[PDB]
């Protein structure tokens, strides 16, 4: 696939989310999606509208870097927390389907 | 089978320096003899005391006090081992039924004063 690939380590929570642009190593410095910088109302960030809005700018910078395939690393809070995300996982999957990113090497990085 | 030969084998096995339980189990598994309570009609230590092979303390108190002294080995090694420390207290409760019965049945002396401190001397 001409080595046009990357990895998205999505550390997401119930009311917040973050994106780590990764290679197999720590490379592919593409972008990092913020949690509540897209909309500050303490309920839109929990909704999938603000998460997909931040993912639209994240995928635009990811296309600027040059990573096409995304290896999923779904990270939750874990431990004494709920160990699950809110709507950030569905919004990132919808943004991946809208961007047409290749699905492969998908894993869960939750603790 | 020869009931006197079985009695002679019991006296010889008691004089071998082994326990009477291991003496009789070797007779019951390698010699084919029935029992001391068999038609020979003489008990184990009754033959041994007649032959001068009986022990000083009884057959249920000599090594039992040795296990009482050994039960406090972990208590001396660790005072926090309250399971072993009270097992030695339960080994004082393993002094269980019949010593003061022997004060009236005349088996041990009434001024013997059996205790765990002298059980180390009576262990060997």
């Amino acid at each position: 696939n001409s080595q046009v690939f990357g990895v998205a380590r999505i550390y997401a929570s119930f009311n917040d989310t973050f994106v780590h642009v990764t290679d197999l190593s720590g490379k592919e410095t593409i972008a990092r999606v913020t949690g509540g910088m897209k909309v500050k109302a303490d309920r839109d960030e929990s909704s999938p509208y603000a998460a997909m809005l931040a993912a639209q700018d994240v995928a635009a910078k990811c296309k600027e870097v040059g990573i096409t395939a995304v290896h999923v690393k779904i990270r939750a809070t874990g431990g004494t927390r709920t160990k699950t995300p809110g709507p950030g996982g569905q919004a990132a999957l919808r943004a991946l389907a809208r961007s047409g990113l290749r699905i492969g090497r998908i894993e869960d990085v939750t603790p | 089978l020869s009931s006197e030969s079985v009695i002679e084998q019991i006296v010889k096995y008691a004089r071998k320096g082994l326990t009477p339980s291991q003496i009789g189990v070797l007779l019951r598994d390698a010699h084919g003899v029935t029992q001391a309570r068999v038609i020979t009609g003489n008990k184990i230590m009754r033959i041994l005391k007649s032959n001068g092979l009986a022990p000083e303390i009884p057959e249920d108190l000599y090594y039992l006090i040795k296990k009482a002294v050994s039960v406090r080995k972990h208590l001396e090694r660790n005072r926090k081992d309250k399971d072993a420390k009270f097992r030695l207290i339960l080994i004082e409760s393993r002094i269980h039924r019949l010593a003061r019965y022997y004060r009236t049945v005349a088996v041990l002396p009434p001024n013997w004063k059996y205790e765990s401190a002298t059980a180390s001397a009576l262990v060997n």
């Binding site: 119930f14 929990s46 999938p48 995304v70 999923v72 779904i74 709920t82 160990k83 699950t84 809110g86 709507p87 996982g89 569905q90 919004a91 990132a92 999957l93 919808r94 991946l96 389907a97 990113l101 699905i103 492969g104 090497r105 998908i106 894993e107 869960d108 | -």
Partner: protein, 175 residues
């Protein structure tokens, strides 16, 4: 891609095989290789290339966790949508005495079930306690406070006042 695999209980494989027909017919169309390895005693699902969305792998992982929670699999694997959250909370690591665990489980069940499941119905959670874990499904907003109240009821305090406070909070939610 990769795969998600987990072992299940003794009665879980018999329960899942009764609904494994339509589950595998939808998972294979959604690029999930949902099969029950009865020789190894585990259920696995591999992410294939026939998925139109990347949430199929996350939904199959939640469905495998719901199937391995000894709960109703057809009533707990339909959380593939975004506004449908199903999770299991392990409440077995809360008590040590068996009599205290039995007394806490009776308080968690409540009088004839509905005395403690009314707040679960008010929070819209399909709560089902199986052994050391309790699995509930519903909206994420309604289950976040429900799981927090479940963790409060799993504490050493009496859950009778917590259930009364949960009903008071549900009554105050009408406004």
């Amino acid at each position: 891609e990769s795969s998600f695999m987990t072992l299940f209980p003794k009665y879980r494989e018999s329960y899942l095989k009764t609904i494994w027909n339509d589950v595998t017919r939808a998972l294979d169309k959604h690029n999930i290789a949902c099969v029950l390895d009865l020789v190894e005693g585990s259920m696995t699902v591999k992410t294939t290339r026939k998925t139109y969305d990347p949430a199929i792998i996350l939904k199959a992982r939640d469905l495998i966790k719901l199937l391995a929670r000894s709960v109703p699999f057809p009533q707990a694997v339909k959380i593939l949508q975004d506004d449908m959250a199903c999770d299991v909370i392990k409440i077995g690591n809360f008590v040590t005495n068996k009599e205290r665990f039995v007394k806490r489980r009776q308080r968690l069940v409540g009088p004839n079930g509905n005395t403690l499941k009314a707040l679960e119905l008010l929070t819209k959670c399909y709560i089902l306690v199986q052994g050391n874990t309790v699995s509930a499904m519903g909206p994420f907003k309604g289950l976040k406070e429900v799981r927090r109240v479940v963790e409060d009821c799993m504490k050493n305090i009496h859950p009778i006042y917590h259930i009364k406070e949960l009903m008071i909070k549900r009554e105050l939610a009408k406004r």
